[PDB]
Scaffold this active site. Structure first.
Site, PDB file in Angstrom:
ATOM      1  N   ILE A   1       0.904  -1.350   0.021  1.00  0.00           N
ATOM      2  CA  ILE A   1      -0.072   0.147   0.160  1.00  0.00           C
ATOM      3  C   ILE A   1       1.040   1.432   0.103  1.00  0.00           C
ATOM      4  O   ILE A   1       0.492   2.287  -0.566  1.00  0.00           O
ATOM      5  CB  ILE A   1      -1.060  -0.032   1.067  1.00  0.00           C
ATOM      6  CG1 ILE A   1      -1.973  -1.246   0.932  1.00  0.00           C
ATOM      7  CG2 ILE A   1      -1.699   1.350   1.339  1.00  0.00           C
ATOM      8  CD1 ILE A   1      -2.886  -1.323   2.035  1.00  0.00           C
ATOM      9  N   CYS A   2       2.041   1.115   0.680  1.00  0.00           N
ATOM     10  CA  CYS A   2       2.744   2.386   0.763  1.00  0.00           C
ATOM     11  C   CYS A   2       3.488   2.780  -0.515  1.00  0.00           C
ATOM     12  O   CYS A   2       3.500   3.709  -0.983  1.00  0.00           O
ATOM     13  CB  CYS A   2       4.037   2.114   1.626  1.00  0.00           C
ATOM     14  SG  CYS A   2       3.605   2.236   3.666  1.00  0.00           S
ATOM     15  N   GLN A   3       3.714   1.556  -1.358  1.00  0.00           N
ATOM     16  CA  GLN A   3       4.126   1.687  -2.719  1.00  0.00           C
ATOM     17  C   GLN A   3       3.185   2.327  -3.585  1.00  0.00           C
ATOM     18  O   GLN A   3       3.545   3.457  -4.154  1.00  0.00           O
ATOM     19  CB  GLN A   3       4.675   0.421  -3.308  1.00  0.00           C
ATOM     20  CG  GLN A   3       5.172   0.053  -4.822  1.00  0.00           C
ATOM     21  CD  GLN A   3       6.577   0.519  -4.793  1.00  0.00           C
ATOM     22  OE1 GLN A   3       6.968   1.584  -5.261  1.00  0.00           O
ATOM     23  NE2 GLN A   3       7.431  -0.446  -4.219  1.00  0.00           N
TER      24      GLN A   3
END
Lengths: 153, 153
Positions: B44-46
């Site tokens: 999700i951070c990506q």
């Protein structure tokens, strides 16, 4: 492969959390992008779904919904989704094996997996866009957003 | 979590190139978008940061600057940034572990990572936009650009 103008086969499939997802549920509410893919944990569709994740607001909003489908069961899709950042639905055309994929005409009978087919289903449940690219060729996602964009404003 | 109206806690953190970045340095010059995130190399951070990357001119320009902050050390953010094509700053809230994250009230005590906290700090250093979503949730970046736009025109 079903062509544009066909009514989209309705389906009820479990997502990565074992929840039931039905195409019919979007009728009258959202256009739906169906992204069939062969197998979780493989190079090509990983890149494809990574693009989708990175552009999610264009696919999952007030006018559109995006559903990825392959023959894998929920645990498989959950692990891959969690590891990949896939916050959208990955549905299991697991058992019966490839039933939905066959109905959309995107099933590889020989290998037992779905081909990389894509469709956009309108608010009436009619297929308005159908795509099947050559092997080793990634799908044009700017194409999906254009297709979706034509069914709105 | 700190809310709108609060003075944004000042900090001096190492970026991915080991250069010092201090928040106060933007006062009287630019509105600052603070994007805390749990961890580098996660899905999700990506997706969130690829979105920022894809729309960077909207967050890094004459009126605004953006800083992504996480508990990872310089080497970790450097590799991730180079592989991901991130040209914006990634700051290390590494040692003390999550101190800045704790100051903004977006530190997840049980896991040892910043939650998905986002803040807009105006030119006087006051917080003008604040939100904190969970590591499993995804943020709406339209809110980010909208708040940045309100401090411009």
């Amino acid at each position: 492969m079903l062509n544009v103008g066909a009514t989209a086969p309705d389906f009820t499939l479990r997502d990565q959390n074992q929840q039931l997802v039905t195409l019919r549920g979007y009728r009258g509410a959202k256009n739906v992008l169906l992204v069939f893919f062969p197998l979780a944990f493989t190079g090509i569709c990983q890149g494809e779904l990574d693009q989708l994740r990175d552009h999610l607001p264009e696919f999952e909003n007030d006018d559109s919904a995006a559903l990825a489908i392959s023959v894998g069961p929920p645990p498989t899709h959950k692990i891959w989704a969690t590891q990949s950042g896939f916050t959208f639905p990955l549905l299991s055309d697991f058992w019966p094996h490839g039933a939905v994929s066959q109905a959309y005409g995107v099933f590889n009978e020989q290998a037992g997996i779905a081909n990389r087919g894509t469709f956009v289903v309108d608010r009436s449940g009619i297929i308005r866009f159908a795509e099947m690219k050559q092997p080793g060729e990634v799908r044009d996602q700017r194409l999906w957003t254009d297709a979706l964009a034509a069914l709105t404003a």
